[PDB]
Chain A
């Protein structure tokens, strides 16, 4: 009942959700389920990447810049 109205991607269930969605898409021989899972996974990946880049936007982006510049 708690998971019903509470969004799955909040907050640490992202990667586990990605793996579970990939398994669900793979386990289905129907094309509609595969396409829906692909779209959902793409949206979740985009959101998670944006969230991770926002968190690493400061103090980690700088050192990545200077590491690429170092090498």
Chain B
């Protein structure tokens, strides 16, 4: 549903980097340079933001009220 707080393999906090990653991709960044800028060096941590699919945006379309 939502970006994991930590990389499964490493333990590095990647929960505060999904929105920043989306912003850097809002810029004309190539998909790898965004990860490089976010300080993600290991490929295990890079896969966290590469492969993540944000479904919580789709689940929030089902408003309980309003």
Tell me, yes or no, whether A and B come into direct contact in the complex with CB atoms closer than 8 A.
yes
Residue B10, interface by CB 8 Å: no
Q: How many Å from the CB of A16 to the closest CB on chain B? A: 14
Contact, CB under 8 Å: B26 / A55: no
Contact of A12 among B25, B26, B65 (CB under 8 A): B65
Give A63 to B28 CA distance when docked, in angstroms. 14
Name the interface residues of A18-71: CB closer than 8 Å to any CB of B: 51, 55, 59-60, 62-63, 65-66, 69-70
- Chain B residues within 8 Å of A, Cβ to Cβ: 22-23, 25-26, 28, 54, 57, 60, 63, 65-66
Q: What are 6 of the A-B contact pairs (CB < 8 Å)?
A: A12-B63, A60-B60, A62-B26, A63-B22, A65-B26, A69-B26
